[PDB]
Homo-oligomer: 223 residues x 3
């Protein structure tokens, strides 16, 4: 079950890599090339992640459980690129882009600490990591969206959809974590693997396609 879902991750991400890579090579202009290149590397990184986990790398027994700590290594590299999908389309300001990137990095590092420390101290870091996540939620839902809407007055719904899908998908990660054996142990590592793999596929391949469609919608509103 765990192995099966890791190999689904390998294949889904490698497929996503292939599509965005071809997309980058055939891109119309620099803006399409930028957005395809972003999503190509997001999926390539995740494909390497899933390859490593499937082959038994980046996993050690922590708190009595085999723990796939390597997810934080690759998430640290791929999730800023996802946030750059948003700020590239929104044409977000410099300080707001750095705030998104900074908050995200803080979230992952303190989430990594939560994952490798024993209970109950791990809950302290979980709370700190969630607080950094809540900052991201506020930044995307208010200043990022408002500015993006002012700059794309005809496409306001496009950005509302982008942020909605983003926060729906990302919010499920700490829910999976807290319900997993890291917290309340309401399901097994096998199901935990399934949930993170579903989320990763939706938030990288799925969201990657949404970002491309969002750019088409932005172009069509100024044709």
């Amino acid at each position: 079950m765990t192995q099966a879902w890791l190999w689904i991750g390998v294949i889904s991400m490698a497929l996503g890599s292939v599509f965005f890579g071809f997309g980058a090579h055939n891109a119309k202009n620099e803006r399409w090339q930028i957005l395809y290149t972003l999503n190509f590397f997001i999926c390539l990184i995740a494909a390497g992640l899933y390859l490593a986990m499937a082959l038994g790398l980046g996993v050690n027994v922590i708190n009595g459980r085999p723990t796939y700590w390597v997810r934080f290594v690759t998430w640290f590299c791929s999730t800023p690129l996802l946030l750059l999908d948003l700020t590239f389309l929104g044409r977000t300001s410099l300080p707001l882009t750095g705030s998104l990137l900074g908050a995200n990095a803080y979230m992952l590092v303190t989430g990594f600490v939560a994952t490798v420390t024993p209970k109950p101290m791990s809950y302290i870091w979980y709370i700190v990591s969630c607080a950094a996540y809540l900052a991201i939620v506020y930044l995307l839902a208010q200043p990022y969206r408002i500015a993006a809407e002012r700059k794309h007055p005809r496409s306001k719904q496009a950005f509302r959809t982008l942020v909605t899908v983003h926060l729906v998908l990302w919010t499920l990660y700490p829910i999976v974590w807290i319900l997993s054996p890291e917290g309340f142990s309401t399901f097994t590592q096998g199901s935990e693997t399934m949930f993170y793999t579903l989320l990763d596929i939706a938030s990288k391949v799925g969201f990657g396609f949404l970002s491309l469609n969002t750019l088409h919608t932005l172009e069509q509103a100024t044709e």
Copy 2:
């Protein structure tokens, strides 16, 4: 004593985070937003550092002593942001900004090597790290200051003060290190903790306020 000073660090940095965070949310324009955001993340990172150390994380017995090696992890992230305070206010050129950032990173990595290696080889890395620090001192005191002064002809003293406080504070770190049990063992880990915590508070919260006042002085000289 060590625990007391670590908790003073937690509180001081978390307070500093709160002030700059509010400052960033209320900032007048993009320039104030940039500088508050820089100082917010400097203090937030240090608050995470002190939280981790206070809870017994990032410390292992090295050379027979409990050693808070995690300081190098977070210093690596927060001190480039401090240097960006200076180059943002000075409007420093691209190569000079990279030189400051590069020299700083080199200083911390070789300082980390000095801290985890045994004597006398540790002294070799201490000397290399100090050499990288001396490059920073020269870069700030001569090309950074001279260029900054040419661009702010009415505020030359503002930058002289910025650089003076910076180099006074940063020079005390290798002095603390060499006098600590890492070198001549003239004081205990408890006092060592006190000195690094005082320095960190002065060079992050204190210097952060100075940087904000420096920007006000720069604005007032062109009103």
Copy 3:
């Protein structure tokens, strides 16, 4: 033999650092200052690498062999600066520069995995790392060169030479790796050390001088 070649590395890189550092301090304009600063840090990083290896740091017994894994730490920092030599001279676009940097980082991380895993699984990562290298080869030999040539119509041969020397030197690294005890064991660690040291000196000090001469050639074609 291993120690001798590590000390040759220390000296060659430290010499290279000194020349580019002086060059940066005396640079004519910002463009010369940028290119000297790039090459100064490339050589300074490699000098720290060779100092650490010569003193017995960054080497652990992996797969029954002492293995200088630290090379990947410093290569990760210095090789993007080499690629920036190329994109600075070519005035390469943003997505193409990120693609070069991204592919390079992927190459080194999966190459690091190949180096620390046992056979035959290490061959899987070797193949993945080479695939990332082949992407670099294609990106430099086609889109990077073509764009660079369109922007420097009078200096097309300069860029052809730059890319040729680059790919000749970089291709020798995976050949050394696969023929070393990491692969077919056709030569000893002593010779392996000699080859990586020769390559590092050619691809950093040597290529650094080529990059400077290339800039002179670019300037002379518009005098």
